[PDB]
Amino acid sequence: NLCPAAAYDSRYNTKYLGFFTHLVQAQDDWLFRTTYDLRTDFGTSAEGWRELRALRDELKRKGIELVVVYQPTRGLVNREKLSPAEKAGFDYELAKKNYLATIARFRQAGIWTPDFSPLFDEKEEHAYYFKGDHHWTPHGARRSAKIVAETLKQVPGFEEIPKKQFESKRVGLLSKLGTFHKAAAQLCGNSYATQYVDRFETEPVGASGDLFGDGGNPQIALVGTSNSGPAYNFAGFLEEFSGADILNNAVSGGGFDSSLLAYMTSEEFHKNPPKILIWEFATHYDMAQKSFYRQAMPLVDNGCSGRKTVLSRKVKLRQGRNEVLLNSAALPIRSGSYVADVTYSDPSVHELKNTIWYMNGRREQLKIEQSKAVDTGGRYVFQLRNDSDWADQQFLSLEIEAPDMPQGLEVQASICQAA
Numbered sequence: 001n002l003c004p005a006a007a008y009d010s011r012y013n014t015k016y017l018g019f020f021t022h023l024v025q026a027q028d029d030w031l032f033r034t035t036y037d038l039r040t041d042f043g044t045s046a047e048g049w050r051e052l053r054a055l056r057d058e059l060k061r062k063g064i065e066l067v068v069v070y071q072p073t074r075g076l077v078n079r080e081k082l083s084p085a086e087k088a089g090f091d092y093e094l095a096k097k098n099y100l101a102t103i104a105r106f107r108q109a110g111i112w113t114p115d116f117s118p119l120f121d122e123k124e125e126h127a128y129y130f131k132g133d134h135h136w137t138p139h140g141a142r143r144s145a146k147i148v149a150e151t152l153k154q155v156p157g158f159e160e161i162p163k164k165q166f167e168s169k170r171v172g173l174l175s176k177l178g179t180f181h182k183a184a185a186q187l188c189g190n191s192y193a194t195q196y197v198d199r200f201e202t203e204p205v206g207a208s209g210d211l212f213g214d215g216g217n218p219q220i221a222l223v224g225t226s227n228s229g230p231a232y233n234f235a236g237f238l239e240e241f242s243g244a245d246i247l248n249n250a251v252s253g254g255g256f257d258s259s260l261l262a263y264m265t266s267e268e269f270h271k272n273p274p275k276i277l278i279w280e281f282a283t284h285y286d287m288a289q290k291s292f293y294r295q296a297m298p299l300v301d302n303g304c305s306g307r308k309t310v311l312s313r314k315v316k317l318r319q320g321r322n323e324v325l326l327n328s329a330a331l332p333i334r335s336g337s338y339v340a341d342v343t344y345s346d347p348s349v350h351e352l353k354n355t356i357w358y359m360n361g362r363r364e365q366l367k368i369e370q371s372k373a374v375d376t377g378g379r380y381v382f383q384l385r386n387d388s389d390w391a392d393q394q395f396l397s398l399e400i401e402a403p404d405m406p407q408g409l410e411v412q413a414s415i416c417q418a419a
Contacts, residue, residue: 001025001190002023002024002025002031002184002187002188002190003187003188003189003190005187005188006022006023006024006184006187006188007022007024008022009021009022009034009035011187016183016186017183017186017187019033019036019134019179019183020033020036020179020180020183021033021034021035021036022034022035023180023183023184023187024038024083024086025083026081026082026083026086027081027082027083028081028131029131029132029181029192029193030078030081030082030131030132031131031132031178031180031181031184032074032075032081032082032086032180033074033180036073036074036134036283036284037073037074037075038073038075038086038089038090038095039073039075039095039283040091040094040095040098041098042095042098042099042101042102042283043098043101043102043105043287044286044287044288045288047288048286048287048288049105049108049109051287051288051290051292051293052106052109052111052287053109053110054293054297055293055296055297056109056110056111057110058297058300059277059300060110061300062273062300062301063273063275064273064274064275064276064277065112065155065156065157065275065276065277066110066111066112066277066279067111067112067113067114067148067151067152067155067276067277067278067279068106068111068112068113068278068279068280068281069114069144069148069224069278069279069280069281070102070103070106070113070116070281070282070283071116071136071144071227071280071281071282071283072099072116072117072119072120072283073095073099073283074129074134075090075092075095076092076095076096076099076120076121077116077119077120077121077122077128077129077140078122078127078128078129079092079120079121080121080122080123081127092121096117096120099117099283100115100117103115103117112151112154112155113151114144114147114148114150114151115147116144116147118147119143119144119147124139124143126139126197126198127139127140128140128143130176130178130195130197131178131181131192131195132177132178132179132180132181132184132192132195133176133178133179133180133181133195134179134180134282135176135226135227135232136227136232136234137174137197137232138174138197138198138199138200138231138232138233139197139198140232141227141232141233141234141237142168142200142233142237144234144237145234145237145238145240145241146237146241148238148241148242148278149238149241149242150241152220152238152242152244152276152278153242155275155276157219157275157276158244158275158276159213160213160214160219160275161213161214161219161220161244161275161276162210162211162212162213162214162216162217162218162219162244162245163210163211163213163243163244164204164206164211164239164243164244164245165204165205165206165243166202166203166204166205166236166239166240166243167202167203167205167240168200168201168202168233168236168237168240169200169201169202169203170198170199170200171199171200171201172199173196173197173198173199174196174197174198174199174231174232175194175195175196176194176195176196176197177192177193177194177195178192178195199231199233200233200236200237201233201236202233202235202236202237202239202240214275217272218244218245218246218247218274219244219245219274219275219276220238220242220244220245220246220247220274220275220276220277220278221246221247221249221263221269221274221276221277221278222234222235222238222246222247222248222249222250222278222280223249223250223251223259223260223263223277223278223279223280224249224250224251224254224259224278224279224280224281225250225251225252225253225254225255225259225280225281225282226250226252226253226254227250227280227282228248228250228259228280229250229252230248234280235248235250238278246278247274249262249263249266250280251371251373251374252373253371253372253373254371254373254374255281255285255371256281256285256286256287256289256292257289257292258370258371258373258374259374260277260279260296261292261295261296261299261370261374261376262371262374262375262376264296264299264300265299265376265377265379265380265381266376270301270302270305291366291368291382294366294382294383294385295368295380295381295382297383298339298381298382298383298418299381301419303339303340303341303379303381303416304339304340304341304381304414304415304416305341307416307417308416308417309341309414309415309416310331310333310415310416310417311325311326311327311331311333311413311414311415312325312412312413312414312415313325313412313413313414314410314411314412314413315410315411316408316409316410317400317402317403317405317409317410317411318402319402319405320401320402321355321399321400321401321402322399322400322401322402322411323397323398323399324397324398324399324400324411324413325397325398325413325414325415326396326397327394327395327396327397330359332394333394333395333415334391334392334393334394334395335356335358335384335385335386335390335391335392335393335394335395336384336385336386336390336391336392337386337391337417337418338383338384338395338415338416338417338418339381339382339383339384339415339416339417339418340354340381340382340383340384340398340413340414340415341379341380341381341413341414341415341416342354342379342380342381342400342411342412342413342414343377343378343379343380343411343412343413344378344379344409344410344411345378345408345409345410345411345412346378346406346409347375347376347377347378348378348406349378349403349405349406349409350369350370350371350372350374351367351368351369351370351403352367352368352370352380352400353365353366353367353368353400353401353403354366354367354368354382354398354399354400354401355397355398355399355400355401356384356385356395356397356398356399357395357396357397357398357399358393358394358395358396359393359394359395359396360393360394362390362393364385364390366382366385368380368382383418395415398413398415400413
């Protein structure tokens with residue numbers, strides 16, 4: 001039913017289109033993406049695995065256990081919706097093997113990791129995935145949350161977490177015209193039916209003993225993508241099957257990084273850290289991205305908050321370059337053991353362009369893009385570079401390139417010792 005042009009990866013050469021490379025027509029109105037859905041490669045580089053373990057450890061030091069929800073591919077779960085040709089062409093066993101190996105590597109990094117493989121190659125009346133979209137249906141989210149809940153119960157400390165009874169009810173229908181279907185419409189002029197599935201919500205029921213473990217506060221937090229959003233009720237099913245409150249901090253559009261970064265920038269996170277942090281994302285993200293970890297690591301301990309700065313200053317941004325902090329007294333500030341903490345006056349500024357000068361004339365240009373949908377109060381936090389040959393350098397200056405900058409916009413920067 002798809003037009004011939006749809007079969008060529010080079011036809012998907014744009015921003016919108018690159019998320020669909022390339023579309024194939026399966027049974028009924030099922031579409032699959034070859035590179036996203038029918039992939040056989042999973043995981044990350046050795047550096048990625050080291051960064052994941054380091055982050056897990058930092059979290060563990062703070063009394064936080066990490067659970068990763070590694071959402072499986074549409075190909076692994078809904079294999080059977082493929083055409084016989086496509087099914088024959090999709091190396092399902094290789095994909096499954098590589099996926100499971102990746103799950104094992106998560107575990108080896110000290111991360112609790114639910115195994116979704118019993119859901120693979122499913123035969124279910126309510127399909128795990130939408131026909132022409134990248135989101136799971138609520139039923140998919142539900143079957144996933146049952147397994148995750150089983151992992152949560154194994155997590156050290158889970159027994160002390162306050163327990164409640166939750167019930168999930170269907171409260172309406174959820175309409176979705178899938179993104180793959182829309183992409184195919186743009187490419188081929190095709191037209192696909194909007195899907196309507198069961199929409200669910202979850203509520204506490206019963207009496208208001210076990211409710212008061214850990215003083216009664218919620219102890220489990222969820223960070224994630226649009227998949228953990230309210231429409232699919234992933235958090236609600238987690239509560240239903242686990243008996244525990246789930247603080248949902250998912251960010252739609254946030255991808256791999258945004259939700260967790262915004263959450264760990266929040267004050268409540270550092271005031272009352274969760275015993276358990278659940279982290280949900282899919283298989284196409286680059287898990288080794290260094291600028292992610294440079295923020296996440298120092299964010300575990302609230303950057304410079306509560307702790308004395310060696311330098312601190314507030315300047316109004318001019319168009320272009322702004323020198324923000326200058327070590328004019330030539331104080332001892334070793335890079336690979338120092339941290340930056342920075343706050344815009346306008347919380348709607350979702351981009352930060354930094355230049356870091358050292359006493360040897362070298363420079364680092366660090367550019368941090370933040371999701372449009374989050375609000376960290378305009379705050380950003382990052383470690384000074386500690387690559388092989390940078391950790392040793394003496395800090396000289398921090399400069400900030402102005403953002404469509406709001407008028408009057410100022411910025412507050414501070415540099416502190418790291419623990």
